[PDB]
Amino acid sequence: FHKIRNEDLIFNESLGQGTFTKIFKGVRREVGDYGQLHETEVLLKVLDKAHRNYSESFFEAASMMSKLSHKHLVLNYGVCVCGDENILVQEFVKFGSLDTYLKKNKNCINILWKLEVAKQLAAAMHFLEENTLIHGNVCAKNILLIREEDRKTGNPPFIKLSDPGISITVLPKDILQERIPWVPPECIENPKNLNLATDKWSFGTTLWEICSGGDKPLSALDSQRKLQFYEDRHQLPAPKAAELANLINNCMDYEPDHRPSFRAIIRDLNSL
Numbered sequence: 249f250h251k252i253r254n255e256d257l258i259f260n261e262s263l264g265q266g267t268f269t270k271i272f273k274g275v276r277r278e279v280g281d282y283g284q285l286h287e288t289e290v291l292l293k294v295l296d297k298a299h300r301n302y303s304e305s306f307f308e309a310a311s312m313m314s315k316l317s318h319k320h321l322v323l324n325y326g327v328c329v330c331g332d333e334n335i336l337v338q339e340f341v342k343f344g345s346l347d348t349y350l351k352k353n354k355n356c357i358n359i360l361w362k363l364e365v366a367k368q369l370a371a372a373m374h375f376l377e378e379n380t381l382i383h384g385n386v387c388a389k390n391i392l393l394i395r396e397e398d399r400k401t402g403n404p405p406f407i408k409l410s411d412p413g414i415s416i417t418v419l420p421k422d423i424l425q426e427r428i429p430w431v432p433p434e435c436i437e438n439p440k441n442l443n444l445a446t447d448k449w450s451f452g453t454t455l456w457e458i459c460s461g462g463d464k465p466l467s468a469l470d471s472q473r474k475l476q477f478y479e480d481r482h483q484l485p486a487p488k489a490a491e492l493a494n495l496i497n498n499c500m501d502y503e504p505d506h507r508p509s510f511r512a513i514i515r516d517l518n519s520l
């Protein structure tokens with residue numbers, strides 16, 4: 249990663265927190281193309297100082313994905329590791345995370361919008377699959393909305409997939425249990441079962457979110473009941489708008505080897 253000086257970063261409003269991270273809107277002063285000076289809006293992801301031992305994991309996966317440029321993968325500008333901070337400096341996406349957007353626009357998002365966002369997410373995951381790169385945390389909060397749909401000019405929405413964050417292969421077991429049903433059953437049994445197949449399961453969970461107006465699946469279940477949900481081999485309920493329900497269940501297959509490739513997933517989406 250390119251190293252950015254703390255002096256060139258200005259922290260502004262908080263935009264929430266993640267797993268052992270805090271999120272801020274920021275500005276980066278930089279020299280851009282042709283030597284022009286810019287003050288660029290950025291998203292700053294700050295690793296909690298108390299959790300400095302997770303720094304390697306947060307940055308590694310972000311790094312490996314940033315070695316692969318793709319239109320549906322978020323741009324990272326660099327890192328700031330001056331002083332006692334570990335900061336990821338990322339492109340600022342105008343409309344933020346998709347989960348909050350789905351809730352705030354539920355009475356405006358139709359099946360064609362969902363199918364377009366689903367196709368774009370599958371395209372990003374196919375790219376990752378072909379590069380044998382595991383994401384490990386596909387969820388609606390990690391889908392960033394670059395552009396809204398514009399029925400006036402026929403423009404579809406446009407999304408990017410955000411960075412993975414700290415790997416589930418190093419997180420505490422109680423955090424992994426809280427992330428059921430995004431974390432697949434095999435990874436609850438053994439976090440070292442993290443595999444390409446993991447992302448197919450979480451992709452299914454993410455489609456469920458996209459179809460459910462921002463609801464979080466199994467949110468009414470505490471961690472103990474989420475564990476028993478997997479032990480009893482339950483599936484998620486079909487969303488009210490159930491057009492993607494079969495694909496969701498096909499992806500959320502308790503047998504990891506049976507989950508369809510993203511090429512097949514894309515073919516399925518294109519048939520709807």
Ligand SMILES: Nc1nc(Nc2ccc(S(N)(=O)=O)cc2)nn1C(=O)Nc1ccc(-c2ccnc(C(=O)O)c2)cc1
Nearest residue numbers: 263266267291338339340341342343344389390410413
């Ligand atoms: N690049 C980028 N630009 C923006 N712009 C923006 C944000 C908000 C609003 S707003 N307030 O007006 O709605 C408007 C514009 N957000 N953003 C970004 O990456 N956000 C982000 C934060 C946290 C996770 C996350 C997901 C799952 N797990 C974790 C974990 O660490 O556990 C973390 C993912 C993404």
